[PDB]
Design an enzyme around this catalytic site. Structure first.
Site, PDB file in Angstrom:
ATOM      1  N   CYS A 179       7.064  40.984 -43.674  1.00 54.41           N
ATOM      2  CA  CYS A 179       8.279  40.288 -43.267  1.00 54.41           C
ATOM      3  C   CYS A 179       8.973  39.614 -44.449  1.00 54.41           C
ATOM      4  O   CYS A 179       8.381  39.362 -45.503  1.00 54.41           O
ATOM      5  CB  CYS A 179       7.973  39.222 -42.221  1.00 54.41           C
ATOM      6  SG  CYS A 179       7.491  39.894 -40.629  1.00 54.41           S
ATOM      7  N   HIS A 216      12.171  35.989 -40.524  1.00 50.66           N
ATOM      8  CA  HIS A 216      11.819  34.924 -39.591  1.00 50.66           C
ATOM      9  C   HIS A 216      11.436  33.643 -40.325  1.00 50.66           C
ATOM     10  O   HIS A 216      11.229  33.628 -41.542  1.00 50.66           O
ATOM     11  CB  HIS A 216      10.674  35.360 -38.658  1.00 50.66           C
ATOM     12  CG  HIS A 216       9.355  35.525 -39.354  1.00 50.66           C
ATOM     13  ND1 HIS A 216       8.519  34.465 -39.634  1.00 50.66           N
ATOM     14  CD2 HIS A 216       8.738  36.626 -39.844  1.00 50.66           C
ATOM     15  CE1 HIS A 216       7.442  34.907 -40.261  1.00 50.66           C
ATOM     16  NE2 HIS A 216       7.551  36.218 -40.399  1.00 50.66           N
TER      17      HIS A 216
END
Ligand SMILES: *[C@@H](O)[C@H]([C@@H](C)O)[C@H]1C[C@H](S[C@@H]2CCN(C(C)=N)C2)C(C(=O)O)N1
Length: 352
Positions: free
Chosen positions: A299, A281
């Protein structure tokens, strides 16, 4: 000399537990069928069709659970006439379970996409479920079932799909005893196609997420992965859903927001790659550390434009591979970690 006609059905008079996964049929010998009717307990007729030569009649619509059907048939030949009446009862489930198959019908997916069949109830007889699922592949490739939990089974080949492969999934559970008197509520069918080979490799040694399309490097993204105390697990990840923006809520993945590794933050251009909650992201706040230092909760943090690039160009079933982090290995039963299970273990399955 001149024989009387003979009537043979695929059920017998007095039978019980007749499964409704198959039609009921009648055949005449030494004569032809003049009439065949089948009615349920309430006198409602069942649709059927007589073959043009008069030799074989068959039901043509679904037969119902928990029904008592009465079959009447007359056959005529040169030798005379024969009539029979049969009553049988179909399976009476204690429970019904409904299958849900992924990926969606007509979808084009990446080379890492497993077939997924999730029931809405625990499956007592996994072997019956596997047997009722018919997978067709073209070009044909061998594959195998493996259960992620009590409700969801996965099917995949030994290696990533060949781009261009057709995959056809027939979940033929209607009328099938899936164990302990649980039967399939319905059948489901889906068909999908494998698209380009897309494999993005994140190498902690370089801090680069490299995207290769059919072997060619098309993008190199500086990334920031999990800091030491919340590392990104190494291993193979299957791309799942993608989001223009999404609130990432740690409690979704088992971690109280209010706890030290908790968080709740609105994020842009997010592609999920594990059920444990790893995403690629947009991380504007760590652009400076991307390509240098790990700062995330797990992430793959990349620039806003690179995250949007990833959203636009990477599809469900494409592959992310993480190597050389200080993490462990992504669990094979994550939900998107199927490829971390060695083939020999996957092929042996876990139906018992
Ligand atoms: C991925 O690392 C995750 C999670 C879904 O696995 C999310 C969670 C964060 S939020 C973190 C706290 C607040 N942050 C800022 C500065 N806005 C970052 C996250 C991450 O960037 O670490 N990604």
């Amino acid at each position: 000399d001149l024989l009387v006609p003979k009537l043979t059905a695929s059920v017998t008079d007095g039978a019980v537990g007749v499964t409704v996964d198959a039609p009921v049929s009648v055949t005449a010998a030494d004569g032809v069928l003049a009439a065949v009717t089948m009615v349920n307990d309430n006198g409602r007729p069942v649709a059927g069709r007589l073959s043009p030569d008069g030799l074989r009649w068959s039901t043509t619509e679904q037969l119902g659970y928990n029904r008592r059907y009465t079959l009447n048939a007359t056959a005529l030949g040169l030798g005379g006439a024969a009539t029979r009446q049969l009553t049988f009862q179909t399976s009476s489930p204690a429970h019904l379970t409904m299958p849900y198959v992924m990926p969606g019908d007509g979808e084009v997916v990446g080379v890492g996409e497993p077939v997924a069949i999730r029931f809405d109830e625990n499956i007592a007889d996994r072997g019956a479920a596997e047997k009722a699922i018919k997978i067709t592949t073209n070009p044909p490739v061998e594959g195998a079932f493996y259960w992620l939990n009590n409700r969801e089974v996965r099917w995949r080949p030994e290696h990533f799909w060949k781009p261009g492969t057709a995959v056809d999934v027939a979940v033929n559970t209607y009328g099938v005893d899936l164990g302990e008197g649980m039967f399939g509520e319905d059948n489901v069918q889906t068909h999908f196609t494998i698209g380009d080979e897309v494999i993005a490799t994140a190498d902690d040694n370089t801090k680069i997420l490299t995207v290769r399309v059919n072997g060619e490097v098309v993008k190199s993204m500086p990334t920031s992965m999990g800091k030491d105390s919340t590392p990104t697990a190494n291993g193979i990840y299957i791309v799942g859903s993608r989001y223009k923006h999404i609130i990432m809520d740690s409690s979704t993945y088992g971690v109280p927001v209010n706890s030290p590794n908790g968080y709740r933050t609105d994020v842009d251009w997010a592609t999920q790659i594990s059920y444990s909650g790893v995403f690629v992201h947009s991380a504007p706040w760590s652009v400076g550390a991307q390509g240098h230092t790990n700062t995330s909760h797990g992430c793959l943090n990349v620039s806003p434009s690179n995250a949007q690039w990833f959203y636009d160009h990477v599809k469900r079933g494409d592959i992310v591979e993480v190597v050389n982090t200080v993490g462990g290995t992504l669990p094979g039963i994550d939900g998107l970690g199927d490829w971390n299970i060695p083939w020999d273990q996957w092929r042996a399955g876990n139906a018992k």
